[PDB]
Design a binder for this molecule. Structure first.
Ligand SMILES: O=C(c1ccccc1)c1ccc(-c2cc(C(=O)O)c3cnn(Cc4ccncc4)c3n2)cc1
Ligand SMILES: [Ca+2]
Ligand SMILES: [Ca+2]
Ligand SMILES: [Ca+2]
Ligand SMILES: [Ca+2]
Length: 433
């Protein structure tokens, strides 16, 4: 009966964030609802040969939601979802948001070891996966869950076997009866994000905070109804999902275009076929694209904006993006825990090629501290500490850790080493363990 527990912002910060218009107290489903009202038939997702309009995405996720509610899944319940980069990922996500089921999206590259840890932490009553995944190749994993009383009441499978509950069956046809359902409240948990090294920690994200990061990111990256965003990174990743990600593109009324991964030749033909004009990558993938871009120039001419985040992205490599990939560059330094930094579209070249940008919000607060947690002199290198309208206040059910990474003012210490540049942007120089 209880809603999932999580650490709240102080009432004072929550009020401030409402006052500024960051938190508008709407569910994440807002994105679909509004899209359906404005442009029901414009494309929301392109996946292989499939094309899903906004109203289709809306109907299909409502269908699955009704089926889950009919089975008694809802508020206070959790779910574990593990799907590849396919349209069903978003249908399921919006379905669970609609039903008020708090979902953890595992990476498709996660294995039974991680899945096991996730299941023990959130005890899902719903598990959705794919038979084509190693862990669900057989029933060894599922069975082993019964041997510990951690079996989900419901298990849906993509690429299902005849004796499976077929994910597409539950999506394609509504329930026989009508049970009532609705999203969890806007300042309560919507879903779990995952930290990015020894088994991902769970980051509760509320509707308010996530929708805000999405809406504000979309504005920063100039998304609009003509945006076609390649989704070649894992769909569940905070970067690919919200920065600005698929949610940001849907917020702006554009279209997400799926790819299994960042493999250059496949991505290039997808980009060409659908005239993709935006993409998001990590440096190792940018390098793969650079190796082939000269020869396949014609195929990627439609790219207008490439976001790059993660790892290390030296200036000399960054300059190759507009030079070889023939599109604008935007650097992104963010974290599933909250804070995201973007270079702005009207930043100087120097800023874009040598910094990782600046926070989404004027109310993203940042401390850069020395070994004694004193703020360093302006411009020096220090440890990042941060808080804001979309940065979390603690990991799920982890009081000991939380106390280790938050200070008395609820600043989060990400471990990143950073310096502020004179222009105002941030440069990430390393990481502290
Ligand atoms: O494509 C993947 C991936 C992840 C797991 C399995 C397979 C692929 C992927 C995608 C993004 C990152 C990744 C890693 C870092 C980092 O500091 O280590 C990082 C820092 N900023 N960003 C951009 C970012 C933006 C928003 N939220 C979080 C991160 C990063 N993205 C790392 C990996
Ligand atoms: Ca269609
Ligand atoms: Ca171009
Ligand atoms: Ca060029
Ligand atoms: Ca970190």
């Amino acid at each position: 009966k209880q809603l999932i527990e999580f650490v709240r912002w102080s009432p004072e910060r929550a009020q401030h964030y409402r006052n500024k218009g960051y938190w508008i107290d709407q569910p994440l489903t807002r994105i679909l609802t509004v899209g359906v009202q404005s442009h029901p038939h414009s494309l929301a997702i392109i996946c292989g040969e499939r094309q899903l309009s906004y109203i289709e995405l809306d109907r299909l996720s409502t269908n699955l939601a009704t089926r889950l509610a009919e089975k008694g899944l809802g508020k206070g319940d959790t779910a574990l979802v593990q799907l590849p980069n396919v349209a069903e990922f978003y249908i399921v996500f919006f379905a669970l948001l609609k039903a008020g089921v708090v979902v953890l999206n595992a990476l498709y590259s996660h294995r039974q070891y991680e899945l096991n840890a996730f299941i023990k932490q959130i005890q899902p009553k719903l598990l959705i996966g794919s038979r084509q995944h190693e862990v669900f190749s057989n029933n060894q994993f599922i069975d082993s869950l019964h041997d510990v009383n951690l079996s989900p009441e419901i298990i849906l499978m993509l690429n299902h076997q005849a004796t499976d509950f077929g994910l597409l069956d539950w999506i394609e046809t509504p329930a026989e009866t009508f049970v009532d359902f609705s999203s969890t409240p806007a300042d309560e948990v919507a879903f779990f994000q995952l930290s990015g090294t020894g088994t991902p920690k769970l980051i509760p994200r509320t509707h308010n905070d996530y929708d805000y990061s999405v809406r504000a990111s979309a504005e920063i990256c100039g998304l609009n109804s003509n945006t076609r965003l390649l989704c070649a990174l894992p769909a569940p990743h905070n970067f690919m999902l919200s920065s600005p990600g698929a949610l940001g593109v849907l917020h702006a009324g554009g279209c997400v275009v799926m790819a299994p991964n960042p493999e250059p030749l496949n991505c290039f033909s997808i980009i060409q076929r659908h005239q993709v004009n935006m993409a998001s990558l990590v440096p190792s993938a940018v390098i793969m694209w650079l190796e082939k871009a000269a020869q396949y120039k014609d195929q990627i001419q439609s790219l207008k904006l490439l976001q790059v985040g993660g790892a290390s992205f030296p200036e000399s490599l960054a300059r190759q993006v507009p030079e070889v990939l023939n599109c604008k560059l935007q650097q992104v330094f963010g974290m599933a825990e909250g804070l995201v930094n973007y270079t702005r579209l009207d930043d100087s070249d120097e800023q874009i090629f040598t910094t990782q940008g600046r926070p989404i919000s004027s109310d993203d607060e940042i401390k850069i501290v020395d070994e004694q947690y004193r703020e360093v002199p302006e411009g020096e290198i220090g440890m990042l500490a941060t808080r804001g309208p979309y940065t979390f206040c603690g990991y799920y059910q982890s009081p000991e850790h939380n106390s280790q990474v938050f200070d008395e003012d609820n600043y989060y210490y990400s471990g990143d080493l950073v310096q502020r540049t004179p222009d105002g942007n941030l440069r990430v120089v390393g990481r502290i363990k």
